[PDB]
Design a protein around this ligand. Structure first.
Ligand SMILES: O=c1c(O)c(-c2ccc(O)c(O)c2)oc2cc(O)cc(O)c12
Length: 851
């Protein structure tokens, strides 16, 4: 234990934002055990990754080129402008030649490598140029691919630092509830409370027992023994002893894994500190409440016994086969009757041939029966139909949600994920990282898969860091487990990344202190005091001096390096919440422009919800890639940094729809349908440009209508919708009456050439693109269902319900034929033109006038 070895932990601890060594809030040593067990999976990843490729994190995709990009490449060639000094050469190149044929073919025309100008994005390795996302991005963006020739980075910068019985216990299970202790009680005194003890598994309660009600006092005793109807030998690994307390309604809960990470049956005394309620993921944690001084506690007693340990295991009637498929063919949200289940089970080996049955089949399992489980494991010993199945993210996600607590059922889904290439991991990472909250133990296959894909790739690890840190900073329920996974990662990403993260962490702490210190200059009046402006430009000075790091990677776009702050352009938005608007220079001289990097840091909205939505949006964008479509969404970058703070990308050349109305019209709701188009034109003199800023609108507007309606958030005020001086429209702020499917106001239809209720050229163009994108999603109904369902379970602070999830099922018209569907959407589009500005005017009355 040298000083060097201690300093390291200390740094990592401040990088994580929680002390992973702490042991003040543990009733066992699972965390310590898990930090120790991750040491091996990390080393294996570090030692087996190529130093260079890892050093340059090439970004690629072995997927085909969409139909909308194919058409953008004359024959099979493309141009690439290479820059040396100020020299520049344009070259037509073999669309299929490794970045190696280039260079060599360049040397023969006019120890290096190609890099995207102004960005840390290298095109290297044995991959067809066209398979590089940067290229594909430029093509669709009709932009010139500018690459500067520079020296390859030196892997040395990624240097890693120096490193007794069995089942048989035919007895039942029981627990003693001695009492509950709370140093304080509710104002609305004179209450009654009781302890409820449930033996849970996969959100399913196998058994349950209570205690008698008593008045709610600072100390309620019982010393009552509760006997459960289940046999010790029947408790499965991952089962939770869920302890709850109701008050004459749920109010406090805590949980304890009955079988620990060593396979032992928990025993002994326990004083667990409980979480209080204000249905969702937090209710499943094995973590205890750290605030011991203010948190209700529960004193319980577990049967003192020697050492009970769990042992690690070693054609049909048509008419029936038909009803079996009727069940296997039901969306994820459909229930399962007792008959449905028994049927599914009896025909295990049959149901087993179809991968889409796994979620349903493994839920008909009676996990409270040791005998049934064993067969279940036997049933999996032979996983040929699965092993050989084609990876289905949607199906695999369903096995990782809160319905399965079994280690072997989850591991098979993780097994199918090993098959994802980096470009896909990056599409499902956020949700894969949220899924860790359903793991019953801190060490898991899914937890090791995220370590492994992180250590193995810089883009993935850059994000894994932020997705976890986001949860460690504002989740007391899961900070410990996530803190252990992030430490393990920080221990193999390299000295380089370790230094970047630090630059980022500094800039963020410093800048958020400012954000809050500025909000406190007027928490109720939308008046950017002339002094409030000088006040801000002043703190940025103090910091910008010799404190704030001169530069830093942009967390939501790692391939970008921020330079200094352009204090002049910095301001405090005229928003109730007073978000900061900051501008920075790019720190890369080779950048082919002088444009700044804009970032907004804000307090008061939950940006974890925005990350969730924004990510599902990129997922939709990729779902349309397969069906060969481009809806022009613009999921700007957004990263939750702490409680109700975080950063947001500033999309250039863009404004609020409402603001557009406000200028032409004014500070009232008499909205003029022509303002928008009169805005595009003024910002796009050149016909060819304006004529192109209209097609974008049609597509962008269409896509958000669809995406926003499928997610159930299509109804919102004008202020939450934005447009770019290139016509790209895009939603924002996702933080008894009138309603609408989405936003398709009169001004929008005006841009498309339809003053009245008469179809137009662009309108039909829009109508076709809609139904098209809409139907393209249904082709993934299940994927969207389980994604929407995971989201509500880990992204919503309030307890969500089935009724909440089901919405998505209707919006996607499950069990319906494409025909009916096409219509459903077109009808929804109709309600829009039938309410014109109705809903907006109302919103303006509610949000603006406080009515
Ligand atoms: O690009 C912009 C952007 O991304 C956001 C944004 C994103 C998420 C939020 O939750 C939020 O409140 C605002 O606002 C803006 C506001 C302007 O006036 C101009 C802009 O260019 C943006």
């Amino acid at each position: 234990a040298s000083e060097e070895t201690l300093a390291f932990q200390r740094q990592l601890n401040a990088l994580i934002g929680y002390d992973v060594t702490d042991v003040s809030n543990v009733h066992d040593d699972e965390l310590e055990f898990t930090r120790r067990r991750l040491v091996t999976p990390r080393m294996a990843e570090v030692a087996g990754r190529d130093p260079k490729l890892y050093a340059m994190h090439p970004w690629v995709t072995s997927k085909p080129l969409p139909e909308y990009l194919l058409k953008k490449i004359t024959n099979n060639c493309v141009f690439i402008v290479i820059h040396r000094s100020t020299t520049s050469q344009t070259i037509k190149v073999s669309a299929d030649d490794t970045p190696g044929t280039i260079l060599q073919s360049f040397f023969t025309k006019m120890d290096f490598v190609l890099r995207v100008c102004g960005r840390d994005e290298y095109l290297v390795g044995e991959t067809p140029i066209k398979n590089f996302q940067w290229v594909r991005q430029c093509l669709k963006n009709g932009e010139e691919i500018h690459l500067v020739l520079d020296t390859p980075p030196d892997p040395a910068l990624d240097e890693v630092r120096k490193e007794v019985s069995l089942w048989d216990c035919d007895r039942k299970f029981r627990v003693k509830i001695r009492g509950i202790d709370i140093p304080v009680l509710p104002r609305t005194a004179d209450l009654t409370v009781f302890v409820e003890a449930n033996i849970q598994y996969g959100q399913q309660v196998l058994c349950q027992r209570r205690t008698s009600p008593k008045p709610f006092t600072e100390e309620v005793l019982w010393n009552v023994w509760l006997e459960f109807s289940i046999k010790i030998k029947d408790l499965p690994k991952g089962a939770l002893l869920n302890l709850q307390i109701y008050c004459g309604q749920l109010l406090y809960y805590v949980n304890l894994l009955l079988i620990d990470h060593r396979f032992l049956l928990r025993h002994g005394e326990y004083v667990l500190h409980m979480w209080q309620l204000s249905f969702n993921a937090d209710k499943l944690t094995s973590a205890t409440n750290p605030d011991k001084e203010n948190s209700m506690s529960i004193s319980i007693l577990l049967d003192n016994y020697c050492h009970p340990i769990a042992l690690p295991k070693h054609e049909m009637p048509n008419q029936l086969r038909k009803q079996l498929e009727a069940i296997i063919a039901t969306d994820p949200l459909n229930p399962l009757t007792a008959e449905d289940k028994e049927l599914l089970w009896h025909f295990r080996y049959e149901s087993l041939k179809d991968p889409k049955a796994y979620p349903k089949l493994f839920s008909s399992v009676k996990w409270g029966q040791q005998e049934i489980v064993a067969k279940t494991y036997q049933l999996l010993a032979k996983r040929e139909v699965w092993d050989q199945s084609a990876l289905d993210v949607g199906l695999t996600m369903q096995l990782l949600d809160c319905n399965f607590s079994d280690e072997n059922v989850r591991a098979i889904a993780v097994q199918k994920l090993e098959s994802l290439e980096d470009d896909d991991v990056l599409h499902y990472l956020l949700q894969l990282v949220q899924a860790v909250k359903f793991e019953p133990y801190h060490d898991s296959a899914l937890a090791r898969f995220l370590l492994k894909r992180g250590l193995r790739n810089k883009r993935i690890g850059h994000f894994l860091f932020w997705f976890l840190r986001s949860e460690i900073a504002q989740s007391r329920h899961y900070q410990q487990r996530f803190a252990v996974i992030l430490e393990a990662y920080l221990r193999g990403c390299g000295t380089a990344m370790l230094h970047d993260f630090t630059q980022q962490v500094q800039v963020i702490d410093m800048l958020q202190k400012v954000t809050i210190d500025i909000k406190s200059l007027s928490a109720e009046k939308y008046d950017v005091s002339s002094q409030v402006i000088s006040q801000l430009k002043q703190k940025l000075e103090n910091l910008q001096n010799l404190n704030l790091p001169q530069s830093f990677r942009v967390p939501y776009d790692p391939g970008l390096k921020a330079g200094a702050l352009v204090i002049e352009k910095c301001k405090v938005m005229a928003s109730k919440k007073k978000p900061l608007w900051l501008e920075f220079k790019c720190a890369d001289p080779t950048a082919l422009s002088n444009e700044t990097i804009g970032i907004i840091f804000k307090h008061g909205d939950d940006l974890r919800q925005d990350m969730l939505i924004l990510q599902i949006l990129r997922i939709m964008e990729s779902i349309w890639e397969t069906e060969s479509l481009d809806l022009c969404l613009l999921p700007y970058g957004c990263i939750s940094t702490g409680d109700k703070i975080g950063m947001i990308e500033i999309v250039k050349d863009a404004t609020t729809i409402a603001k557009i109305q406000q200028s032409t019209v004014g500070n009232t709701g008499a909205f003029k349908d022509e303002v928008l188009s009169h805005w595009l034109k003024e910002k796009c003199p050149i016909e060819e440009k304006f004529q192109a800023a209209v097609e974008r609108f049609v597509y962008s507007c269409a896509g958000y209508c669809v995406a926003t309606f499928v997610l159930g958030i299509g109804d919102r005020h004008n202020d939450n919708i934005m447009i770019s001086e290139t016509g790209n429209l895009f939603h924002i702020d996702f933080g008894n009456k009138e309603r609408v499917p989405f936003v398709l106001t009169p001004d929008f239809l005006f841009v498309m050439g339809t003053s009245g209720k008469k179809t137009s050229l662009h309108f039909q163009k829009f109508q076709d693109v809609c139904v098209k994108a809409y139907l393209a999603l249904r082709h993934h109904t299940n994927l969207l269902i389980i994604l929407f369902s995971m989201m509500l379970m880990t992204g919503m602070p309030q307890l969500t319900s089935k009724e909440d999830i089901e919405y998505i099922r209707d919006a996607l018209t499950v069990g319906k034929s494409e025909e009916d569907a096409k219509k459903y959407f077109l009808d929804q589009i109709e309600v829009c033109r039938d309410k014109g500005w109705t809903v907006q005017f109302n919103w303006f009355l509610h949000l603006v006038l406080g009515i």
